[PDB]
């Protein structure tokens, strides 16, 4: 999805495996705020939210708490106390095509800043001046959205990057979603120290 229309997917009632993602050895960025990524398996939450989009390579550092910028103010803003992980990797061969890709758009102007975790799909003509636009684009009346152009020869800084944000939630609930547990083959006829579930 585009940055101005970032998609959401809730995940619950299953057994996650964070170590495989940790050791994929293919992602470019992996920052987890407030949680140990190597100890994520030894934790158990109620549900997780996954959000994905494609943005500019040079904008990847606006996806963080306490970030100021056009993306942080008009498209996608994270709360200052956000707990979870941010992942991003290059998509040169998949998203950048000869002639450019115009299927990805980003918002330019907005009347007010964005709170954490909401979307803006409206496309009403912005009113920069003190005169109503009345549906015609011109002086002091600009369209709110334009599109990126992804050319193969572009620099890595302007190369597209795919970004996924995982956010974990905690609430009074069964807290179903969390990682697995390992098991050893049983031994019999000896003094052993056992652990069967609890």
């Amino acid at each position, epitope marked *: 999805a585009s940055v101005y229309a970032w998609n959401r997917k809730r995940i619950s009632n299953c057994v996650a495996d964070y170590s495989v993602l940790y050791n994929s050895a293919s992602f470019s960025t992996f920052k987890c705020y407030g949680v140990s990524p190597t100890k994520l398996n030894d934790l158990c939450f109620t549900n997780v939210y996954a959000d994905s989009f494609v943005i500019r390579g040079d904008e990847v550092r606006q996806i963080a708490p306490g970030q100021t910028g056009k993306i942080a103010d008009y498209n996608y803003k994270l709360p200052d106390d956000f707990t979870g992980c941010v992942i991003a990797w290059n998509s040169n061969n998949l998203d950048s095509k000869v002639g450019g890709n115009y299927n990805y758009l980003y918002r330019l*102007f907005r009347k007010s800043n964005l709170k954490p975790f909401e979307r803006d799909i409206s496309t009403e003509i912005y009113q*920069a001046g003190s005169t109503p636009c009345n549906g015609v684009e011109g002086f002091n009346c600009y369209f709110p959205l334009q599109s990126y152009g992804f050319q193969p020869t572009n620099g890595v800084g302007y190369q597209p990057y795919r970004v996924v944000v995982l956010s974990f939630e905690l609430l009074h609930a069964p807290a179903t979603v969390c990682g697995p547990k390992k098991s050893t083959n049983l031994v019999k006829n000896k003094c052993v120290n056992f652990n069967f579930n609890g």
Partner: antibody
Amino acid sequence: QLVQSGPEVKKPGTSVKVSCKASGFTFYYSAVQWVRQARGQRLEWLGWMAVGSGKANYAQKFQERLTLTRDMSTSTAYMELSSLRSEDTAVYYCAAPNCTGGSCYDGFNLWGQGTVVTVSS
Amino acid sequence: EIVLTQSPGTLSLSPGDRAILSCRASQTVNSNYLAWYQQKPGQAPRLLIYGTSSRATGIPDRFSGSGSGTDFTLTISRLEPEDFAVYYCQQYGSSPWLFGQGTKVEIKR
């Protein structure tokens, strides 16, 4: 306030680039129009461009020779005009409104100091 | 397109009197995209009236715009020596923002 580049003298059959730098106001929400005037003549309109998205509009006479660009790093607008002739010798001005925030002034109150361009041999 | 013409070419008026300037268009022009600019020899133009009715910042009250539709008028109530320049009328509603030929105001003796 707007600051333009210095005057210049070029040769026919070439291209010239003129810079208009802006400071002291929100350059993100503004828009720049270019007006040239000969010696003791009437003002002639060339085109305009919205800095926010880079979209530009040109007059029909200079449709295929005039190109307007911008850079957000230095808040500067650029004219490039190719295949100059003798009659192109004139003074150029960049005009843009005063933007303080989302709202902006409804007129081109801010004007540059002009740039002198002479084309001859 | 839209063509703007200033009917009074040059006016030789002694200071004190009332000065009138007229700008006329071929087609209807939006009343929210008209402006008057004052230019002296050797200086960049200065905005005087915008929006066909309201004046700019710091412009004295004596200047007054009026009219709507195909006709627009600029009025100077009393002349002062620094008010002799060339005045242009511009519209920026359509795509070509054509100017006017201009009117020169000089003293009379």
